Short mmCIF file of C-alpha atoms (C1' of nucleotides) in Angstrom, two decimals:
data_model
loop_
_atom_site.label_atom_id
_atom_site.label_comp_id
_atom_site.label_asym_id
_atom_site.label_seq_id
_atom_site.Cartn_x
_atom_site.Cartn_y
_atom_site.Cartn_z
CA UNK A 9 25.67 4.21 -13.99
CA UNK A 10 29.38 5.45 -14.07
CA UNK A 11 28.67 6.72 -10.73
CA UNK A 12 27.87 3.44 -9.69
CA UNK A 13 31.11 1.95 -11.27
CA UNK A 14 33.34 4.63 -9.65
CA UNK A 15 32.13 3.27 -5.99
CA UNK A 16 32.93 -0.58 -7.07
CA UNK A 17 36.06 0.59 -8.76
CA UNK A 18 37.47 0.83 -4.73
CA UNK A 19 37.03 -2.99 -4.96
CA UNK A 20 38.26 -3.98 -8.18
CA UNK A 21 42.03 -5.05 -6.36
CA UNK A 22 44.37 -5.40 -9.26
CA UNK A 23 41.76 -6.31 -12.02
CA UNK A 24 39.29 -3.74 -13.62
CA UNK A 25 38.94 -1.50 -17.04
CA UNK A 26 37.83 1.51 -15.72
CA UNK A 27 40.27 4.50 -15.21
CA UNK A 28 40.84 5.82 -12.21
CA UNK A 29 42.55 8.60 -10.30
CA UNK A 30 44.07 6.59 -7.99
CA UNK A 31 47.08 4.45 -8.54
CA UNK A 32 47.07 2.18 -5.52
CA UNK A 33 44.62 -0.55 -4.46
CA UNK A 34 42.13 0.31 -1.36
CA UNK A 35 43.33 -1.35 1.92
CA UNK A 36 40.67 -1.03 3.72
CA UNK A 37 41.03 -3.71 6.55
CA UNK A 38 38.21 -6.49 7.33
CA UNK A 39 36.16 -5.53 10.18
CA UNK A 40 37.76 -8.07 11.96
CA UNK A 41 40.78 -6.24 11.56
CA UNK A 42 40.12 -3.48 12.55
CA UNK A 43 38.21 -4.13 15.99
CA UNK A 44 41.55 -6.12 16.62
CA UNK A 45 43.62 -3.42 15.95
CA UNK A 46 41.78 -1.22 18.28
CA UNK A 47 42.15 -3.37 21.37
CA UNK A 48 45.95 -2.27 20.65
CA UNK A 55 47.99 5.19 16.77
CA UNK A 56 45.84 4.70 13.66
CA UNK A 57 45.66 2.24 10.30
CA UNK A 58 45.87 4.28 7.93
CA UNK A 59 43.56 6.98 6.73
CA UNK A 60 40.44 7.82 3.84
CA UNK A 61 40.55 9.79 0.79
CA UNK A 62 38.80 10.45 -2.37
CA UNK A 63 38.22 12.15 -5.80
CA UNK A 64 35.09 13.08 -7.17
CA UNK A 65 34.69 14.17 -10.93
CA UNK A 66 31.08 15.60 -10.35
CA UNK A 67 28.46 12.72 -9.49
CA UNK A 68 31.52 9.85 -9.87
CA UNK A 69 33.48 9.78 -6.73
CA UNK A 70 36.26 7.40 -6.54
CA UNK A 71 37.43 6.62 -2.92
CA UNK A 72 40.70 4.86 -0.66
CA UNK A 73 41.31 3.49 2.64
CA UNK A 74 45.60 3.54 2.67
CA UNK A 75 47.13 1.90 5.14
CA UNK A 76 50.29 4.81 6.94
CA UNK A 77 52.39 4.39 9.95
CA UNK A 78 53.57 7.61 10.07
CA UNK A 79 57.11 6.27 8.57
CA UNK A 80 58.85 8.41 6.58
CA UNK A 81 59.07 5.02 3.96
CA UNK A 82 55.11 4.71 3.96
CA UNK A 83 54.62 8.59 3.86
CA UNK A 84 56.12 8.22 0.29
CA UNK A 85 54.37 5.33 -0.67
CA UNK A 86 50.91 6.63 -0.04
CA UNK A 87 51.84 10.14 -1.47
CA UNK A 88 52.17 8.17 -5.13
CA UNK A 89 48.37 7.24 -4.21
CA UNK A 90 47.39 9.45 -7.14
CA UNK A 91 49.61 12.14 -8.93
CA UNK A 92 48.08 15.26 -11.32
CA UNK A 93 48.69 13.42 -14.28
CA UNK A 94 46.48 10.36 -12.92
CA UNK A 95 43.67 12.53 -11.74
CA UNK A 96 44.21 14.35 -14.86
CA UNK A 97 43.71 11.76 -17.29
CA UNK A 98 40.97 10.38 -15.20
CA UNK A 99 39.03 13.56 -15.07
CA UNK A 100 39.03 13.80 -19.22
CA UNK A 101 37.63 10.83 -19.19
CA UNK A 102 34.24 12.05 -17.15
CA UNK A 103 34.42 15.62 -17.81
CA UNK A 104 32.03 16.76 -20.83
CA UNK A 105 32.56 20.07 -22.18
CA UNK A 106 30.62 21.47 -19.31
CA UNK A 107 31.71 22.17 -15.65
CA UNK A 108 31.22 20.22 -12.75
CA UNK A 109 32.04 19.98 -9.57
CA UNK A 110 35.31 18.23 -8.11
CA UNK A 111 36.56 17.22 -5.02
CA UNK A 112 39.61 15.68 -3.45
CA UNK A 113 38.94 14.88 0.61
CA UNK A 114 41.05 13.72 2.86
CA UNK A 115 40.79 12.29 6.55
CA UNK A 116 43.44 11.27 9.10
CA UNK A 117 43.62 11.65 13.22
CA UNK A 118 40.41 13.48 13.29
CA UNK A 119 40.84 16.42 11.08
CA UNK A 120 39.53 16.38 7.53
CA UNK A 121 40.77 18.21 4.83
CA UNK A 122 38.67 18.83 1.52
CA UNK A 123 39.39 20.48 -1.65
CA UNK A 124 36.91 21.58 -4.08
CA UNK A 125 35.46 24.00 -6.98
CA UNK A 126 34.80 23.42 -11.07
CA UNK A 127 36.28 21.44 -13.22
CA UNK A 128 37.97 24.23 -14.79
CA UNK A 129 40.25 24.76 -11.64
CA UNK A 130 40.98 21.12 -11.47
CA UNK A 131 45.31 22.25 -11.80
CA UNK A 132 45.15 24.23 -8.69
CA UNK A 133 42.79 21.63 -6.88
CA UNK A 134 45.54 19.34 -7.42
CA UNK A 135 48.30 21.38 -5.79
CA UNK A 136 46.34 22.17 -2.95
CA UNK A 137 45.59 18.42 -2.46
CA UNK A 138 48.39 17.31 -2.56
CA UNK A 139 50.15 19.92 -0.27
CA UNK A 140 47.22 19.33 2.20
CA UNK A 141 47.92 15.64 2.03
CA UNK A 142 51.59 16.08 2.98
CA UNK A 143 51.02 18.77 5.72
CA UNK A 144 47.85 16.21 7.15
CA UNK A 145 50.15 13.29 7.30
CA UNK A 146 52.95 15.39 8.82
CA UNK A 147 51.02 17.11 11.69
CA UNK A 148 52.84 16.85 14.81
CA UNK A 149 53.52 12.93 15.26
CA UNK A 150 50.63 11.65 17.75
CA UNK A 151 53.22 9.99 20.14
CA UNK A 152 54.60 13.72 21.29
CA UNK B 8 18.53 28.93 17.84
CA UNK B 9 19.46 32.65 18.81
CA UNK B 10 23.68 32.62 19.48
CA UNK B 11 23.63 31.51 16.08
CA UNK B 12 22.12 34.68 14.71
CA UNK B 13 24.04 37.10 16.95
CA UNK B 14 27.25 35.05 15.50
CA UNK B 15 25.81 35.44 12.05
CA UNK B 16 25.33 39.31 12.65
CA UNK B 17 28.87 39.65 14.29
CA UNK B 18 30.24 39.96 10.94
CA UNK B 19 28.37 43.18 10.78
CA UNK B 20 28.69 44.70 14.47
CA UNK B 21 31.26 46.88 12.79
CA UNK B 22 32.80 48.41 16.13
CA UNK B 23 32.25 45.90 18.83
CA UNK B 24 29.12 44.15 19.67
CA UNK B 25 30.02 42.42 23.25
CA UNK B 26 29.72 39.38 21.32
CA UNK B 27 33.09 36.79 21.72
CA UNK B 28 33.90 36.14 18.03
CA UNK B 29 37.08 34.23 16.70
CA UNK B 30 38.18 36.64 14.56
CA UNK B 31 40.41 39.54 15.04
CA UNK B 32 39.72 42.11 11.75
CA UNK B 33 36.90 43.78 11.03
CA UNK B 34 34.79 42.45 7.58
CA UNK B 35 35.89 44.25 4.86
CA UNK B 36 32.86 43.10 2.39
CA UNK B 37 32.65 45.68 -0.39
CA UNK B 38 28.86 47.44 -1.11
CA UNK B 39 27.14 46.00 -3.73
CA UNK B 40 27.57 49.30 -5.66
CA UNK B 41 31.35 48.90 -5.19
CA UNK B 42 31.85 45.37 -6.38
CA UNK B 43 29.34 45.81 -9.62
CA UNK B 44 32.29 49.23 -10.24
CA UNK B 45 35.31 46.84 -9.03
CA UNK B 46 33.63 44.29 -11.44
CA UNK B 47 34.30 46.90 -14.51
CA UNK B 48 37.65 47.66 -13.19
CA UNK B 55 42.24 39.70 -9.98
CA UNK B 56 39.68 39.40 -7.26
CA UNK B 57 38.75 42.14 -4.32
CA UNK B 58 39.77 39.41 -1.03
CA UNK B 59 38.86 36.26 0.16
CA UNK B 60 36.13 34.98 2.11
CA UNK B 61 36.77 32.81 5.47
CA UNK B 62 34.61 31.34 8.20
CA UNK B 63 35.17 29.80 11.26
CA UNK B 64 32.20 27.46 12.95
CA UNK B 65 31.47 25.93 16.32
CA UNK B 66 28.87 23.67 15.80
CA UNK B 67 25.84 26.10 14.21
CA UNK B 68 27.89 28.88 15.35
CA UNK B 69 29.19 30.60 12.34
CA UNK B 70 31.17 33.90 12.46
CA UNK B 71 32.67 35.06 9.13
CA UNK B 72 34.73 38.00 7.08
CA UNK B 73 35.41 39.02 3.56
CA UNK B 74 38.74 40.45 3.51
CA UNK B 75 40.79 42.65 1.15
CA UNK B 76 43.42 40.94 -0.42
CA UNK B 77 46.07 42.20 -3.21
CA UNK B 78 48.38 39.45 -3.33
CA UNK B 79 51.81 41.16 -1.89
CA UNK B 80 53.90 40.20 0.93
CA UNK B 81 52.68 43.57 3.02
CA UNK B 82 48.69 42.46 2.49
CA UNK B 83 49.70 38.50 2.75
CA UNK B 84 50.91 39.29 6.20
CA UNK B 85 47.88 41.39 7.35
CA UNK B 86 45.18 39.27 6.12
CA UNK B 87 46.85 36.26 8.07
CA UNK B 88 46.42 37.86 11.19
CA UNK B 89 42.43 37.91 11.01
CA UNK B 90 42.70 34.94 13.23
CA UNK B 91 45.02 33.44 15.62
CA UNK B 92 45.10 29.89 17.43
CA UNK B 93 44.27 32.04 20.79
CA UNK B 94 41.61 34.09 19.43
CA UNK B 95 39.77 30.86 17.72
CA UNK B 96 40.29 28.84 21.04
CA UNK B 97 39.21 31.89 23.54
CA UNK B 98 35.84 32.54 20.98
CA UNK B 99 35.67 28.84 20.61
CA UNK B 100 35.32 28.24 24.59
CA UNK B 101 31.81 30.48 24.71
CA UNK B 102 30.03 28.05 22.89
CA UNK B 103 32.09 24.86 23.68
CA UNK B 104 29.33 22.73 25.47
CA UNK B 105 30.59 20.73 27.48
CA UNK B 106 29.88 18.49 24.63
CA UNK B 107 31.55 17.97 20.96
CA UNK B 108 30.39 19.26 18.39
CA UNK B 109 31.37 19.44 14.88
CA UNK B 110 33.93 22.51 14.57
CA UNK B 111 35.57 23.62 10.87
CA UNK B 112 37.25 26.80 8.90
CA UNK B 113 36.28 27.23 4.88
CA UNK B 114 37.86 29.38 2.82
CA UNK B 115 37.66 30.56 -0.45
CA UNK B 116 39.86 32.26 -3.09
CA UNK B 117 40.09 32.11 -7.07
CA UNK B 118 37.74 29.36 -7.32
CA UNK B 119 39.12 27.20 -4.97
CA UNK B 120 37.48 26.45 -1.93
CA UNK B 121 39.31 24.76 1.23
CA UNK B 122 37.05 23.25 4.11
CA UNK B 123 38.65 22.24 7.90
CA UNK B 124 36.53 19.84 9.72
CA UNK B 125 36.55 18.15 12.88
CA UNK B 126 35.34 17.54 16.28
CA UNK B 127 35.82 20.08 18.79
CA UNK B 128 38.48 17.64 20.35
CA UNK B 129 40.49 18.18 17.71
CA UNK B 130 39.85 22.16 17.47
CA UNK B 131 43.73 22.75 17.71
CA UNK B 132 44.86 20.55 14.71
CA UNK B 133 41.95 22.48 12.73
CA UNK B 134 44.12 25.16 13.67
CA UNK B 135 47.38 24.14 12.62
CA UNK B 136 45.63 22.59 9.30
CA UNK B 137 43.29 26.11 8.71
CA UNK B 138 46.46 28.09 9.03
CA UNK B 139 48.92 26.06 6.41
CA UNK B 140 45.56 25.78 4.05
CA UNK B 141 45.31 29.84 4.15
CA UNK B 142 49.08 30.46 3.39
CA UNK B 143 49.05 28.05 0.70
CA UNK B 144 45.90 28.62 -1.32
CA UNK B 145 46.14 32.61 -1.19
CA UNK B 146 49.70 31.82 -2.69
CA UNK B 147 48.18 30.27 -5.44
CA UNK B 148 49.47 31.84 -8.97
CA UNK B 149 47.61 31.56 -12.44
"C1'" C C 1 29.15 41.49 -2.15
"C1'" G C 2 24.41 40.58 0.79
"C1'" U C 3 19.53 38.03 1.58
"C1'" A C 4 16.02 33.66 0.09
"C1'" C C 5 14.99 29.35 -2.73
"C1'" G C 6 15.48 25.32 -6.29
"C1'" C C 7 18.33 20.84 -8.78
"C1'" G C 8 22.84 17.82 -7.94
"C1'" U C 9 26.92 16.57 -4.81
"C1'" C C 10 30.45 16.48 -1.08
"C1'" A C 11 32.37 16.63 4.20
"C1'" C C 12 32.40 17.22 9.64
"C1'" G C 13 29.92 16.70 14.84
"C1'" C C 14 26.20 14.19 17.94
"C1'" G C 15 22.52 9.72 18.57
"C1'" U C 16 21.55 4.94 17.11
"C1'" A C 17 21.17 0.17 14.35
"C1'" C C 18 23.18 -3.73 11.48
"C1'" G C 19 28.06 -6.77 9.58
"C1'" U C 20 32.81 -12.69 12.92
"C1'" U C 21 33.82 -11.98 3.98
"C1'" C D 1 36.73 -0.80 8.63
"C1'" G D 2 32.03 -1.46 6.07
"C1'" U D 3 26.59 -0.31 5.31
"C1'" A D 4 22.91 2.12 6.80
"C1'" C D 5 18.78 5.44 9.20
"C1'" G D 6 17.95 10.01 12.42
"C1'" C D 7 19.38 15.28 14.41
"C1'" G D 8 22.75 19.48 13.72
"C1'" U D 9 26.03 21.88 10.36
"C1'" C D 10 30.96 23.46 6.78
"C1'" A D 11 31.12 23.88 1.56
"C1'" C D 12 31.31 23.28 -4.10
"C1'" G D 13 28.97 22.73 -9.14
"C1'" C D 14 24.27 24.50 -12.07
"C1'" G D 15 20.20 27.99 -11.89
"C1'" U D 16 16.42 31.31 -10.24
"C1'" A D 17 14.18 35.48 -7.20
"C1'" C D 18 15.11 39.78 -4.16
"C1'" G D 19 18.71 44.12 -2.34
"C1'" U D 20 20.58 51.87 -4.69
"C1'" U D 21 22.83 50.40 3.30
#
RNA sequence: CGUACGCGUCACGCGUACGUU
RNA sequence: CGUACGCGUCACGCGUACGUU
């Protein structure tokens, strides 16, 4: 059920009650779009958070800018995923995962809920370094 | 499947086994007799692995968390050596490369298409620094 | 730490099919 | 970009069985 929620939650634009991790609204282009733009570098690139069996998930538009590196590093911050994991996390341990995909490579994070600090360095240290490989153009 | 199993039993060849592997240091996995006695005295090492499509090679390395140890354990692999071991099985064809690692709980997975096979590098590398730099 | 399996889940590669939200 | 099937795999959470290398 919450699992269920979580998925539509990537489609709830600025409306919607239930918390997520992420503090941006998906981007994901039409599929009209996107065929168009590839008749012309990538969009943008995928990511998601998963708090056990409820993953939450993001399509973020990039273009490599230094401006629009920022803005999709506020995408989610530890005190978002934080507060978002309490709310799904019993007083068990489950497993987590932060994923991230961009020019081919993938990067994923993951391990129990206990470790949920350290995922969230990692992640977000494995964003910037993903985002910041060697610009595609040289 | 058979390459696979000769990859999977590369970890144990101990002294050279002909077969082209992409790492550089010999596994360092501890007997189960000396983890239960480490396990009574953080942890031993780390575990990596590097796979080309179903070709998995991987090591258990000793790792103490000081500069000295932080260097060594970062030279089990090298861009050249992954590349080199990664040719033998390339294929003509692309298949679905990646690097895991684990260390403290916190596992860190690499994947992509053997296109890509030298960002995994660059990306495998950073991920290693970083998460054995973790600290409580 | 090493084998094998079970329940749940996640991610990559290859093949293919649908969608002009 | 989305949603799906198929083949091959990286890996995590929970738990079993087996191993004096």
């Amino acid at each position: 059920d919450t699992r269920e929620q979580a998925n539509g939650e990537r489609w709830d634009g600025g409306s919607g009650g239930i918390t997520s991790p992420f503090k941006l609204p998906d981007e994901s282009p039409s599929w009209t779009e996107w065929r168009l733009y590839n008749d012309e570098n990538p969009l943008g690139f995928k990511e998601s958070w998963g708090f056990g069996k409820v993953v939450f998930k993001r399509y973020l538009r990039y273009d490599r800018t230094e401006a629009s590196l920022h803005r999709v590093l506020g995408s989610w911050t530890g005190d978002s995923v934080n507060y978002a994991a309490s709310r799904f996390l019993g007083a068990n341990q489950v497993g987590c995962t932060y994923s991230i995909r961009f020019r081919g490579v993938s990067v994923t994070i993951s391990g129990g809920s206990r470790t949920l600090q350290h995922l969230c360095e990692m992640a977000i240290r494995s964003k910037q370094e993903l985002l910041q490989l060697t610009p595609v153009e040289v």
